[PDB]
Amino acid sequence: LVAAYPIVGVGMEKLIISTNEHASTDQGKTVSRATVQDSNGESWNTGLSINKGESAYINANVRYYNTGTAPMYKVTPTTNLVLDGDTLSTIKAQENQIGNNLSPGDTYPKKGLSPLALNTMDQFSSRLIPINYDQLKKLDAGKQIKLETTQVSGNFGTKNSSGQIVTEGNSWSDYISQIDSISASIILDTENESYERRVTAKNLQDPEDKTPELTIGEAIEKAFGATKKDGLLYFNDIPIDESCVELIFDDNTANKIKDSLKTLSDKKIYNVKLERGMNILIKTPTYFTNFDDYNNYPSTWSNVNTTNQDGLQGSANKLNGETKIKIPMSELKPYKRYVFSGYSKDPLTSNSIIVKIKAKEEKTDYLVPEQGYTKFSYEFETTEKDSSNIEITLIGSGTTYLDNLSITELNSTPEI
Amino acid sequence: LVAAYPIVGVGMEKLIISTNEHASTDQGKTVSRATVQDSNGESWNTGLSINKGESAYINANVRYYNTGTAPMYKVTPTTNLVLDGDTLSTIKAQENQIGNNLSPGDTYPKKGLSPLALNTMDQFSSRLIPINYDQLKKLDAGKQIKLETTQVSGNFGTKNSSGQIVTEGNSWSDYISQIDSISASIILDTENESYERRVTAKNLQ
Numbered sequence: 001l002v003a004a005y006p007i008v009g010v011g012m013e014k015l016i017i018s019t020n021e022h023a024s025t026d027q028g029k030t031v032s033r034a035t036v037q038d039s040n041g042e043s044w045n046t047g048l049s050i051n052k053g054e055s056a057y058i059n060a061n062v063r064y065y066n067t068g069t070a071p072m073y074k075v076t077p078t079t080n081l082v083l084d085g086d087t088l089s090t091i092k093a094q095e096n097q098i099g100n101n102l103s104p105g106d107t108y109p110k111k112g113l114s115p116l117a118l119n120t121m122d123q124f125s126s127r128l129i130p131i132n133y134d135q136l137k138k139l140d141a142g143k144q145i146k147l148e149t150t151q152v153s154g155n156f157g158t159k160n161s162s163g164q165i166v167t168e169g170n171s172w173s174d175y176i177s178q179i180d181s182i183s184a185s186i187i188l189d190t191e192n193e194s195y196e197r198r199v200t201a202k203n204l205q206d207p208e209d210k211t212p213e214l215t216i217g218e219a220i221e222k223a224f225g226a227t228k229k230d231g232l233l234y235f236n237d238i239p240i241d242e243s244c245v246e247l248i249f250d251d252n253t254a255n256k257i258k259d260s261l262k263t264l265s266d267k268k269i270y271n272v273k274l275e276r277g278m279n280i281l282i283k284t285p286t287y288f289t290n291f292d293d294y295n296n297y298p299s300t301w302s303n304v305n306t307t308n309q310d311g312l313q314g315s316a317n318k319l320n321g322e323t324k325i326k327i328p329m330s331e332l333k334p335y336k337r338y339v340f341s342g343y344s345k346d347p348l349t350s351n352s353i354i355v356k357i358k359a360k361e362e363k364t365d366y367l368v369p370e371q372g373y374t375k376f377s378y379e380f381e382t383t384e385k386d387s388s389n390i391e392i393t394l395i396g397s398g399t400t401y402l403d404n405l406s407i408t409e410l411n412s413t414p415e416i
Numbered sequence: 417l418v419a420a421y422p423i424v425g426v427g428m429e430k431l432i433i434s435t436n437e438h439a440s441t442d443q444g445k446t447v448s449r450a451t452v453q454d455s456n457g458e459s460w461n462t463g464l465s466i467n468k469g470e471s472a473y474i475n476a477n478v479r480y481y482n483t484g485t486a487p488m489y490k491v492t493p494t495t496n497l498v499l500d501g502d503t504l505s506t507i508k509a510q511e512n513q514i515g516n517n518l519s520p521g522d523t524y525p526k527k528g529l530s531p532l533a534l535n536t537m538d539q540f541s542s543r544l545i546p547i548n549y550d551q552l553k554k555l556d557a558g559k560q561i562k563l564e565t566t567q568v569s570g571n572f573g574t575k576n577s578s579g580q581i582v583t584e585g586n587s588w589s590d591y592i593s594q595i596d597s598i599s600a601s602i603i604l605d606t607e608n609e610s611y612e613r614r615v616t617a618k619n620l621q
Binding site: 038050080089158177 | 432446447487511516518529530573583
């Protein structure tokens with residue numbers, strides 16, 4: 001129920017520009033004697049020229065990387081060079097920039113090597129890629145380029161009757177679209193790697209279709225090799241729940257999940273039914289604060305007491321006080337939109353203190369909805385490498401802990 | 417009674433013109449002493465040239481879009497560049513502007529990407545497309561160009577006995593005209609998309 005399906009991306013490293021200028025120097029000497037008169041002179045000449053159109057060649061340094069569950073024999077991408085709201089050239093890789101093998105979770109070339117270079121647009125490698133003079137003006141003013149992936153072409157391996165395998169005429173393109181017609185897309189992101197899988201779903205409309213269906217929690221348990229331990233889910237000693245990560249849906253799948261959850265008699269998002277086209281992102285958080293165990297924190301929380309600390313569902317400690325954490329900027333990533341999120345309790349007056357500069361310095365009352373356990377989430381923006389401290393401080397009157405709280409990355413969020 | 421029949425169109429985004437000019441600057445110094453007389457001078461030179469015919473290269477930014485009930489494996493269109501009641505060049509897409517997949521009701525590239533570029537007329541990508549000087553006059557006066565679709569060439573997928581599917585030698589061209597001989601054409605347009613189908617009819621004769 002999980003399809004072998006390699007994903008290929010291209011990463012940019014550096015860009016080398018080259019001006020196709022022309023320079024020249026000349027020197028001459030003149031002597032004359034005529035009948036009495038003489039003449040001796042020296043002439044110098046300095047010259048420079050340039051002909052627009054093929055006035056700036058370029059080359060780019062890329063490397064490839066795989067993520068999925070399959071290799072990709074004889075890989076070939078195509079790229080598009082965008083400069084400023086436009087495109088410059090679309091390049092397919094020729095015979096020189098091709099790649100033989102790509103084992104899943106690796107790179108071409110390997111980790112202990114330097115990147116790859118590409119500079120030509122012709123089918124055989126001649127005639128390097130040019131740049132217009134006004135594009136050279138926009139470039140040397142400071143506006144830099146960026147890259148993309150568009151499509152890839154590669155082969156799989158199958159064995160014939162003689163026991164050897166063949167990779168010739170077996171493309172991967174003619175199985176792309178069909179898979180993307182019948183599957184849901186699940187993307188996990190830890191702090192070291194990423195993973196992207198496709199799991200088939202059940203079209204409930206047409207009744208001849210016999211596909212055994214699952215739920216989204218079952219599909220997460222089935223796709224990744226993840227151990228059910230005491231009912232919860234663990235993956236490479238990492239806890240994964242509906243309560244301990246950050247879930248990202250786009251709005252159409254979010255609306256489907258929304259109007260499907262209202263009719264179900266249980267509030268666990270892992271029990272909703274899977275559907276045909278869904279796009280789910282699971283981001284793990286960096287710093288998790290279960291007050292029973294596993295709090296990877298340098299500084300310690302204040303005003304804690306242990307009567308039934310298990311995370312959610314069992315916290316029953318309700319008293320006055322404050323919790324505070326100061327952690328400097330040095331340990332965390334600069335220039336990124338961090339997200340601080342936790343859960344609820346039933347205190348009466350409780351507010352959050354975030355003194356952090358270059359960010360949301362808004363302090364807000366909690367407005368405790370009920371004694372039922374719901375989330376809360378806020379965001380802020382990271383400055384560049386000061387000793388100024390991250391200071392979180394929860395002042396509460398009638399709760400000393402609720403045992404789920406975290407801060408997370410929220411990546412694809414740069415500053416400038 | 418409804419035939420699997422993909423329709424392909426081409427959309428224009430932007431056009432980049434480039435002048436194939438030539439510029440040069442030169443500087444020289446002269447000194448002389450003769451027997452008493454002396455001379456010191458400085459010469460400067462500025463020059464520009466242009467040779468008509470291959471006097472303006474261009475590139476265009478297009479994207480593809482599908483509407484119908486089928487994919488189109490290894491898609492390739494052909495386009496015609498019209499300027500002012502005439503044509504300039506007919507371009508088939510080479511190996512660089514080809515497209516692998518096109519799921520119905522989508523685009524190549526995807527929605528979250530930038531468009532595609534095409535600039536060459538040779539079979540292998542060299543010798544970008546030129547523009548006559550008088551066409552450059554008509555262009556820089558303000559008269560802009562527009563694009564078309566003319567024909568497309570692509571493949572379908574069929575499975576052999578071993579359970580895998582093949583897309584090689586199966587063209588879509590040799591089923592175009594037959595369908596357009598026996599069917600009625602129905603085009604629906606909502607405010608977000610469009611749809612175009614072909615339904616077979618009954619020759620009563």
